[PDB]
Symmetry: D2
Subunit: 416 residues, 4 copies
């Protein structure tokens, strides 16, 4: 079955355009279910996960059409409010339809997500929020059911600033009676994008991007047209690629405000970075300086760039420590990096990376979306050739990584 073949490459040089954010568009697609009319989403990335959630919207009876990076949803005449086991198992972001469906129908039944490659990942804080809004919660044979005679706005505190729980509860709150206050809200840029979309549909959401979100519920929302924000994680991936290959890459159609920790840490590692209004230039250093990273809720260092930064550190000039505070098990890639000659030792949530002279190409497997991209970055600097398996992990969340890296001068091909 299919492989990505990467060879030892020249320093990457040129421009790369970044696609629309996967993690902005998935919650915004769920949010289209809130509205009694037709939404138009522009800058949608052509990714399998976008097409899976589209099929979940079709399952509940929305009219969905995709072409040329535009998705339209007519949720006027939704029929059903159950998300079946197969769709939630394909893509756990399926769970983000629970808030809108509860808000629209006052009842919903959603398959509970199971095991995940990067950790246990419970959805208790989502349920906490729905209960605070007056929903009664029951489990039935792997499904979570939430139902109420009417959602009522209430104050609630998030024990952790969960992205998904913030999104699900903001969407449920948008049609509740009265005012909801989410305390200790996630501050991620995708939260702001979602809130902006809800306000475009006629909602009243204030404070997104701060620690407190206030939602004043409205009776009805209407379809709206929205431009999704750029993918800050894809942008960061190409920025790391410039750092690791001693390259010179201009990343186009980005928002620097969303990349601050990645810019800071790449500068600490020795990159020269030029921030512009719609683009950033990254010049890799001749010697990578070892740095430590600690993943945290935004605007701390993002867990979605942890594997990529770890790959950079495998050839840094000394010892770097990577601490993962956000996910339990997000070190599955370490054994694959070690197959390529890295020197990485883990205990608990910390990995000690002892820089080596060079990586060596080897047969490796993608374990998840972001680690698979980290393996491509390893492959560009590893002596010889690297063959990466289980490539569906990568292909589901990066648009045409083979074409984009090829245009920057790298040696990469997908063999089917």
């Amino acid at each position: 079955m299919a492989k990505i073949i990467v060879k030892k490459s020249n320093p990457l040089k040129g421009s790369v355009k970044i696609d629309g954010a996967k993690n902005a568009v998935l919650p915004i697609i769920a949010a289209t279910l809130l509205a009694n009319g037709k939404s138009t989403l522009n800058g949608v990335p052509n990714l399998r996960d976008v097409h899976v959630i589209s099929d979940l919207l079709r399952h509940v009876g929305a009219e969905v059409e995709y072409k040329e990076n535009t998705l339209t949803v007519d949720a006027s005449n939704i029929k059903t409010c159950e998300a079946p086991y197969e769709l939630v198992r394909k893509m756990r972001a399926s769970f983000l339809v629970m808030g809108p469906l509860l808000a629209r129908f006052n009842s919903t039944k959603i398959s509970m997500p199971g095991g995940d490659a990067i950790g246990t990942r419970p959805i208790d804080l989502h349920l906490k929020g729905f209960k605070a809004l007056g929903a009664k919660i029951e489990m039935d044979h792997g499904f979570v059911e939430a139902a109420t005679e009417k959602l009522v706005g209430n104050k609630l505190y998030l024990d952790f600033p969960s992205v998904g729980a913030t999104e699900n509860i903001m969407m449920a709150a948008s049609l509740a009676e009265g005012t909801t206050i989410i305390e200790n809200a996630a501050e991620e840029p995708e939260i702001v994008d979602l809130a902006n979309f809800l306000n475009e549909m006629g909602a009243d959401v204030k404070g997104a991007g701060t620690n407190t979100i206030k939602i004043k519920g409205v009776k009805e929302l209407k379809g709206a047209e929205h431009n999704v924000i750029p993918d800050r994680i894809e942008a960061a991936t190409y920025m790391v690629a410039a750092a690791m290959t001693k390259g010179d890459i201009t990343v186009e159609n980005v928002l620097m405000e969303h990349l601050k920790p990645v810019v800071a840490k790449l500068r600490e590692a020795g990159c020269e970075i030029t921030e512009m209004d719609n683009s950033v230039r990254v010049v890799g250093p001749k010697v990578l300086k070892p740095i430590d990273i600690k993943t945290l809720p935004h605007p701390g260092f993002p867990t979605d760039v942890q594997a990529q930064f770890m790959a950079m550190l495998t050839v840094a000039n000394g010892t770097g420590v990577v601490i993962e505070t956000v996910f339990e098990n997000r070190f599955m890639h370490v054994a694959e990096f070690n197959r390529m000659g890295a020197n990485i030792k883990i205990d608990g949530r910390s990995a000690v990376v002892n820089g080596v002279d060079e990586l060596h190409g080897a047969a490796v497997n993608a374990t998840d979306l972001r680690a698979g991209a980290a393996l491509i970055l390893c492959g560009l600097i590893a002596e010889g050739e690297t063959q990466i398996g289980e490539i569906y992990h990568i292909q589901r969340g990066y648009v045409d990584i083979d074409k984009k890296i090829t245009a920057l001068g790298g040696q990469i091909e997908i063999v089917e």
Copy 2:
């Protein structure tokens, strides 16, 4: 030597006035060193740690006068910029004079803090910030020295949203040439109070309380008059006391905006809480519902109320999990709680509290400020009598806890 004797008490009832914040006033006292004139701080709590940092200001040559909760500092004619080993060992918040002294003199030498009861507690992020502003850092026999021909404003990223590093770097930045940007800043209320004081002296500090602080440096600051914010941790201590004793307590001279996670979690445990503009009423439940707590950077659940909430949970109606993400070793109190008949098991940063019918009075020792207060709360509900040793831990950070609890109906005395 001295003991606090607590007996099984009646439900606490009445009003308690909260003192000025220890953790607001300590950095604000350091900040008075920035100014060429006389500052006046009102609402200063009469605590030993306030009197120790006052003696450190006298050591560097400031004129300090304390009476009736007002402290005045004339830093016009500071002489020296070294903080010796004895003062830093007495109180590690001594380290917060490093930023102001570097900013005033372009040189400072500060004893590095050593072991602490609640964890290792490095000051690497403070030094990271001073280096970003152009200081060269050297160690000499237990001292850290920072020196520059001139501080220059620069962008810098905090790997963790350290309270102390945020404070130290904001104060150093206030007299630097140009603009400093602190990314991933601490959002704690004391950060806002300090920033407000710097702006009262003539600084230009924007964004305090958000994830990004921008400081535009000025050439000179002038003495100013400031009213310190209330002590949110003392307020939380009395709120927990009402919860544990099935009491009814109005906490006076507080800011509800600063207590949101404590209010939320006490409500989840079954308290009825009435929030007013300058006060909060807490009515304890007849049965405490078990809750989980996870400490986090503000506005997440504060590590400074973790031991007190754990004490509450020792008699809750089931199993509660306490996770400490902020400090390494902040479970030293567990063995003292277990001497009083608690059922607490720890592994790593998590403690599993299995509620018991009642605690039993025993001889126990305060291990640190907030745990010592938690032992007083245990003592109010424990059958018989509790004798608490090593009481300097408590007395250094609570104003007259014996008099305040006595006025709420509790049985407590300090025996010398």
Copy 3:
């Protein structure tokens, strides 16, 4: 694709015969490569992993024949000493041919194992041991190569009492010149079985099952006939099944000496256990008492029964804590148990299990061998029907679990 369907079952009752140990036979099959003649292994379990390592022996040029639980190996005329990427990826126990091949040929090249479902799982201690015996170690594009002009016996210390490193180093030492001492050796029963087999071939291995193994190297080993020990993990699985179903099961063809922690902990949970010379009877309690388990090196509680005991605890009468000290990531099953209505919270290496009234059948996926068996145990007690996917995990290490449970009265079928 294929599923295991389990229904809510009657209490299990009857006898079950246990097969030969998977984890005894895999290293003993590698060990047959040490000998210049024909070995005969009896009591070999009919498992896919036995058939994969058999194909690896054929790959290096041994004559292998399997029938009716007997495997014969003629390693007289081995040809090659490389274990390719495909075979090591299929089954990481492939790596155990490295010691014998190094000992026979003074050179070997083995694909380094990559990611694993239950943790990173480095093989550094194996290499440490080969280096101590005089091998030079090099990496080539995902392979580890070990080579020497002659293995020489030496003292070496294991930083952790690794089962695999103990096995690999004992086998390499068996043909070395002089005496090897393994300090802090694994004490697992399979170590003793392997040592007994090496001594049957003419080796000199003393101390297996203690903390120190002494190997005096011989010039030549000869094929021998060996009876593999019973599978203590399969035995423990059926013992837990009796505990969870309030059953009464006699487990046949077992060694009680190998099951001591499982017997102790089942007795603590309320089981009545009768230990006999070749069999054990387990009578489940009417109420399961909550217990804590901490996995450790033998003769501590085995990590290979951790998921199964956790499943038992999901319906115990209170709160149980499971700590995994042996593997990093061995909690992937928790999310599947939670789909069936368990109440399990993890942080770090500890899981807090809050017993529920009953589990509910749901669609779940096996994540690994022992967790998949734990899901079958959940299925026997869960209301309704449970459908388990990814069943190759189970089928590769349990002989006919459907037929054995069916004969004890349970409702289980494999649908293809």
Copy 4:
């Protein structure tokens, strides 16, 4: 108050005689309470902790006499079986009189140990064992009471191979009716010494030093004469001193069998070690090679040499990782090492030591017995002078460390 002053020293050279084991003699002194007659213990080290437990024996009514490294106990006419709060707080090894007193009187009441510098340190496994022998356990105001009409031998499993629980339960079992089996027993050398002493008094204890101890109870024990084993931790301290100072030290009156992991790891770091029947010679390397250490139950690497090895690693030629699996909080020394210019970063139970060119003398505080000795070792290699406070930690468990190091050529003095 009192300080230890250490200066930058010459390489240590010469012989040092090791004293009797503190951790052998403390349980053996408790064990003298089992006997109706006079015991004679030879090779007792002249330490404060020996004199505290002696005062506890006097408290319960034993006749105790100490002179010239010989302690005699006549426990013929013991009166009382309570260990009061003051004595247990002075020295938690006081708790080891619980087993003998329960065995002699069928009742005992012992103050429960509270907080400790190196972790929580519960005594649940001791109580588990006493309950298995038929004792009923109750808590009364900080005391644990154990009482029975008669101890009866039973099988029991230790969830962790606790040294103290093994000792306490073996001593209680020695006078029980019938046979006790301790499964997953501690294997530490002090367990063997204690068992040998019990057998000298007329007990029947088999398997000490293995994973299973069988005690066949006797009706009466008689006073006996015993030679305590050497202090393996003191021996290891001087061995590390030779390693760190590039010295050449013969450690006299030791048992190499008890030092295997320390010898192995010092050899891995580059020491040349000569093992003899009663002595070991350690020659420090000119460059220390970085090594990793993981503390474990004997015969794994001892937690009591972890701080000392960490100190060695602060100047090793690269990066070393220290993992503490045995104690929770045993990293309090890290902040003191960092005051001396070390580069140590901790997360969870792991510390990353990045070797520096040299340490610099500074004012530091002992946090516990073994860390305080590690600070002396730092002081011998640190530029200039080191002043160590809180020296009672050191003096309570090392005999004349100033005189022994002075005789090896080091510069050390105690100033009072």
